[PDB]
Write a protein that binds this DNA or RNA. Structure first.
Ligand SMILES: [Mg+2]
Ligand SMILES: [Mg+2]
Ligand SMILES: [Mg+2]
Ligand SMILES: [Mg+2]
Ligand SMILES: [Mg+2]
Ligand SMILES: [Mg+2]
Ligand SMILES: [Mg+2]
Ligand SMILES: [Mg+2]
Ligand SMILES: [Mg+2]
Ligand SMILES: [Mg+2]
Ligand SMILES: [Mg+2]
Ligand SMILES: [Mg+2]
Ligand SMILES: [Mg+2]
Ligand SMILES: [Mg+2]
Lengths: 397, 152, 202
RNA sequence: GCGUGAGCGAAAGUUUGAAAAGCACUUUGGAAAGAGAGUGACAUAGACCUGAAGUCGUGACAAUAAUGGAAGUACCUCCAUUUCGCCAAAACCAGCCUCUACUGAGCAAGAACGAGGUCAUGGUUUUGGCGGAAAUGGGGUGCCCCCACCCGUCUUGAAACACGGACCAAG
RNA sequence: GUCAAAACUUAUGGGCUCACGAACAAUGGAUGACGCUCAAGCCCAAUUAGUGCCCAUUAUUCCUUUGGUAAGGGCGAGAAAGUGUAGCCCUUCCGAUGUAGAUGUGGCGUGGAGGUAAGGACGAAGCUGAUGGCGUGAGCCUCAGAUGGACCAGCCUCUAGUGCAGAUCU
RNA sequence: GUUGGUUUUACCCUACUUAGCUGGAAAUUGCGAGAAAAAAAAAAUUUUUUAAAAUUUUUUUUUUUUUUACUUGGUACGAAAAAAA
RNA sequence: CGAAUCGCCACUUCUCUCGGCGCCAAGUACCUUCAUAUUCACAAGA
RNA sequence: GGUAUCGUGAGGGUAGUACGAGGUACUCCCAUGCCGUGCCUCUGGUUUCUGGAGUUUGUCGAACGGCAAGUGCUCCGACGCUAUCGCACGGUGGUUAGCCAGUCCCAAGACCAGAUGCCCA
């Protein structure tokens, strides 16, 4: 006898019914806090590693640089476009209603369509003309009265700005809409944060901050109808085995006289929703145009960019704000991953640690990439024939 | 003859192909799609299904037939693209627009009103199975018959 | 339009007696609407009854709990299950009667201010329990068994009560009028009637 | 036809029609064929009398483990009968049924008066309702409530995790 | 108490009981289920209360059938001296389950024959049938075929290669 | 005691495992009607404000088009004009 | 579209341990319509 | 009534575990093992990019360029996939370790009068 192969609380292992990785539960509201947003949609870019000086009493690495992998997650600001209130009921939370923003970016209204550009594009057209009228202004006014009254939960309906993402590979132009809960103070305080913020952008740096952790939720990378050996980790059978090796030899017994829900079976692996915890935020990163010397740490002064030399493979440059957080993040490159405020206690000696990066890595992913910089590669090879066949042309002109 | 007499002999064209040597089950599927359709949209469905642009919704004679996305049109997941059966159907619909034309009727107002692929007497052939056995192979040719009134 | 519903108030009724009487009336076609199922009582200490329920919850299909017996934790869902166990739940006669019952935790605003609330004297707690024996109020045990809304309902029950009580003295001037108006109605022209009212006690 | 062989050894009714009069000609099709037309009393008599079951296609229709039993009811009935009698209700008579004595307040105790019920009891009509339809009956389909373990089998014992059992026809 | 007919949870009965309680260790789960606790448990007694009810293929009674080698009467359409039929008629009484098996049957039905009687191209047999009708039943009969195309039912007697869901039957 | 000595079939049903589709609240019907809804409106239970004047006309407000603050290409408020209430 | 249903209400419609009214004149005065709808028959009316 | 979007969350699943060292004999630390959920920056493995090179025999008259050897063979080899062979992560509350709730996973046949967008011939 050995332990069971696989966690039964991650089950059924079925395809997620979404891809945007929506938060399942927001961290519990704390009135003592000032109001804030609790999550932020971001696009996985790729990974690198960083050097860091761990300064953790105990261990053999205190005061010693350690190479942590990091995931880079491009994070163009989300736009709030509507508030949502929930009222508690004996049967469970009910939306009171939502107040949509007076205006909606097309990328958002793209979301209500399968073919926006061959549509009449009438989405939020009556709201636009009605929220304008005093009749619809008083109606919007009444919804907020209902929030301030009957609500227990205020939530912004934010979305991603894919227009601003300018990624060439994330093909979506429908915005990634999602309610983002406002934990904070009294419901009027949450309404007020909610409505002042009701058509504004929301950068991650406001929601998060460095060294703080974030729970991540994104659908994990899809593997199709995976077999039982890859899906559950069961031992494959000895070579001599007949019908085939890669099987659970015994999927049941005489009784109960049927396969139980607990025996492992071939089927969908990957592309499951996951909430992974306590991912330290090694740096929030401002957009490359605004703060070009990303990845230029105090100890590595060369002006530099968070994106590797070949760009991120399959993704390309991170043109925007980026969250850089320790370790792996579930989901393939360029998937949209919601990442919430931590729901764990976060009073751990580790979790509270400030993270001063000593060296973001920027070598090519693609090959081994022994250069941190496109300038430095040229500084190795120096001029070569592509230039001499270039330099000569310039002289002739 | 025809299972159902046309409502108005002068206004309808009949067509038929006995002992059609296409599978009954595929032709059963292929002709039933057409049963209410206007002849031009039925000429069309076949020209399109002959291009793998649309599918014939297999319905009764599904079996462990494969899922397609072109079957959404028909309300179900299974669908299929007979070619031998789609061509015989066009070739029987040519037969009726010809029959419809001679009656002075206009083929492009004409509507399919009755399609009925009966299964025909079957042709024997032989397997040669494992340990010295000889099980049957049998084609299942269909009798397809139809008529198409034009509205008055 | 509303149908001839009768909204039984289930506070401080024995669970299974009220469930038995209600389950019978549903068969006789009554369209009952149980309320305050949170307030149903059960004989014994809560520990007796938590253990009875946790022995219930302990029962699931190993092959696939997903399709197993379902262990609803709402006092109302617990009362519906209790009341479907008392009626022909597989024949349509009983599957029908069970849908004619609407349990609620507390008394919901649609069901309040709709009409008087009935009671089942045969299922009264004082009628049944020996008064000094311990008893389990139902919504209290089931709070410990997983019902998450035990405090949501109490906040609601507090509100309908404080609200119903505010309206009870909003109308005190009104009820006081008819009391005064009706007492002086006897003094009115109803003379011979005043003697036909004395007989019969009016 | 089979087997080296000795030997084994079928199936098949040309029973279209009186006659071939066996579908000329037109029309589409590469054709097979189809649509008309024609023959014949009939071609759903077309190389074929009849034309079952089972199976399938189709149209229309009722619908929502199976089957099954009982009883109703909904709808339908190319069915039957009856009426121009059928459904009811009340009454009457009969039947039938139900609902003192002793003791020292009790019984181990006996009838009476009165009233009720009833035709799925018998005889006496009465009175109304219905009358191309009505009406009763049957049939069909569905539902409702209820009842209901697959049959044959050997066996002490079969629903058996015992055997035989896909369908139908002829035998 | 509900499921479940009946105490719409009867008693104007007694005790007892707090945790279980209600004739013949391992798939989760069984007083039958729920649930019951001044019981919806147990012992006892009861029947509206010091002034019962529910359910049988049982009983009784009524109707009908069948059997009796049971008891009698009788001999507008009928009244037959009769084992048995569409029973000669009426009356009363008792019986009715049933495997193996036995027996009865003016019992059913099939191919053929001796008879009789009749039918059929104005449509025989066969086949089809929300065609009804009759019979306890095997079945018969009628209707309708927008089925068929030429044979044939009745009745008494004779006959048999005579009745099929089951043989791993052909 | 020793040695040598064919390990057949799922393509059915269910279980299960993923994967789809579609119905459905008299769980497909009835029209058989039950909401964890509200019981002139909104803002600070009561008070004040939101078409008017004789169906049409006029006035006001809001939105769209043209000529600073938001991550920085594209949307907002600026203005002015037109249309709708 | 013919339907089955047959008390209502801001006097119950709070809580915690004879609700009012309605039932044939808006009222206790019977002014006052009712037939043949011909003695039951879904109330032919809500 | 369509279509679409955001959610609700009854119900069901459910998981973290162990060891050691430190520190002072609880707290508090710090590593690891197992388990689990991922991920692929790095490192390893994997090459049908038959990428680039080398190379053998046959062959294209030859060089070049190939080609055949069922990927000829050897070297290096990105993308990708993947390894406790790399790496990240593994949270609470309430009741009597259990247990329940939560977090976590599926979640309206739990038929959501939840919200919302658009059109409602
Ligand atoms: Mg082997
Ligand atoms: Mg790489
Ligand atoms: Mg297949
Ligand atoms: Mg397939
Ligand atoms: Mg051979
Ligand atoms: Mg023939
Ligand atoms: Mg034996
Ligand atoms: Mg009962
Ligand atoms: Mg007998
Ligand atoms: Mg013979
Ligand atoms: Mg039939
Ligand atoms: Mg014989
Ligand atoms: Mg419906
Ligand atoms: Mg009526």
């Amino acid at each position: 006898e050995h332990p069971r192969h696989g966690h039964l609380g991650f089950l059924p292992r079925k395809r997620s019914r979404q891809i945007r990785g929506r938060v399942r539960s927001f961290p519990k509201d704390d009135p003592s806090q000032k109001p804030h947003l609790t999550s932020f949609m971001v696009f996985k870019a790729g990974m690198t590693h960083i050097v860091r000086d761990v300064d953790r009493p105990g261990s053999k690495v205190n005061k010693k640089e350690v190479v942590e992998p990091v995931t880079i997650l491009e994070a163009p600001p989300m736009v709030v476009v509507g508030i949502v209130g929930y009222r508690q009921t004996p049967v469970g939370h009910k939306t009171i209603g939502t107040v949509w923003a007076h205006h909606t970016s097309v990328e958002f209204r793209r979301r209500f369509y399968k073919n926006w550009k061959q549509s009449a594009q009438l989405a939020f057209t009556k709201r636009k003309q009605f929220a304008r009228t005093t009749e619809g202004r008083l109606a919007e006014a009444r919804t907020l009265k209902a929030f301030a009254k009957k609500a227990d939960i205020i939530r912004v309906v934010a979305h991603t700005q894919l227009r601003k993402l300018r990624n060439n590979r994330v093909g979506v132009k429908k915005a990634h809409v999602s309610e983002i809960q406002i934990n904070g103070g009294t419901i009027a305080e949450k309404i007020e944060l909610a409505k002042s913020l009701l058509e504004k952008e929301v950068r991650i740096d406001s929601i998060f901050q460095q060294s703080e952790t974030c729970d991540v939720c994104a659908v994990t990378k899809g593997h199709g109808f995976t077999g039982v050996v890859k899906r559950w980790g069961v031992a494959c059978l000895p070579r001599k085995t007949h019908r085939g090796l890669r099987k659970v030899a015994c999927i049941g017994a005489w009784h109960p006289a049927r396969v139980m829900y607990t025996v492992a079976r071939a089927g969908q692996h990957g592309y499951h929703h996951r909430t992974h915890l306590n991912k330290k935020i090694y740096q929030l990163g401002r957009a490359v145009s605004m703060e070009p010397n990303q990845a230029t740490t105090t100890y590595d002064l060369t002006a530099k960019s968070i994106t590797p030399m070949g760009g991120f493979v399959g993704y390309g440059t991170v043109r925007n704000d980026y969250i850089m957080l320790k370790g792996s993040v579930a989901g393939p490159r360029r998937r949209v991953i919601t990442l919430r405020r931590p729901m764990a206690p976060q009073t751990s000696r580790k979790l509270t640690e400030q993270i001063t990066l000593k060296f973001i890595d920027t070598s090519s992913k693609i090959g081994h990439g022994r250069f941190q910089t496109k300038k430095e590669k040229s500084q190795w090879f120096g001029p070569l024939k592509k230039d001499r066949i270039r330099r000569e042309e310039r002289l002739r002109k | 003859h025809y299972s159902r007499k046309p409502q108005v002999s002068s206004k309808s064209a009949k067509a038929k192909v006995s002992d059609l040597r296409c599978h009954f089950k595929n032709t059963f599927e292929t002709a039933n799609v057409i049963n209410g359709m206007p002849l031009r949209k039925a000429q069309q469905l076949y020209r399109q299904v002959l291009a793998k642009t649309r599918c014939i919704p297999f319905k009764r004679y599904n079996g462990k037939i494969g899922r397609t996305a072109q079957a959404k049109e028909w309300g179900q997941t299974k669908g299929r693209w007979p070619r031998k059966s789609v061509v015989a159907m066009l070739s029987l619909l040519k037969n009726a627009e010809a029959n419809a034309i001679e009656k002075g009727l206009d083929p492009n107002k004409m509507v399919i009103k009755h399609v009925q692929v009966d299964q025909a007497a079957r042709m024997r052939r032989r397997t040669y199975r494992a340990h010295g056995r000889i099980t049957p192979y049998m084609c299942s040719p269909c009798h397809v018959q139809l008529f198409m009134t034009q509205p008055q | 339009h509303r149908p001839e519903i009768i909204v039984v108030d289930l506070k401080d009724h024995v669970l299974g007696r009220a469930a038995a009487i209600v389950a019978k009336q549903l068969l006789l076609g009554k369209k009952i609407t149980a309320v305050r199922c949170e307030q149903l009582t059960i004989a014994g200490t809560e520990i007796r009854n938590k253990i009875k329920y946790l022995q219930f919850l302990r029962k699931r299909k190993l092959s696939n709990p997903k399709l197993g017996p379902f262990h609803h934790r709402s006092p109302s869902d617990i009362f519906l299950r209790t009341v479907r166990s008392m009626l022909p739940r597989y024949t349509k006669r009983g599957q029908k009667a069970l849908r004619q019952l609407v349990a609620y935790e507390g008394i919901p605003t649609n069901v309040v201010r709709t009409g008087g609330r009935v009671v089942i004297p045969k299922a009264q707690r004082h009628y049944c329990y020996r008064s000094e024996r311990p008893y389990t109020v139902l919504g209290n045990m089931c709070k410990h068994v997983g019902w998450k809304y035990s405090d949501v309902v109490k906040k609601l029950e507090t509100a309908r009560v404080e609200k119903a009580a505010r309206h009870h003295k909003k109308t005190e001037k009104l009820r006081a009028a008819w009391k005064s108006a009706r007492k002086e109605a006897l003094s009115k022209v109803s003379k011979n009637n005043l003697e036909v009212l004395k007989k019969f006690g009016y």
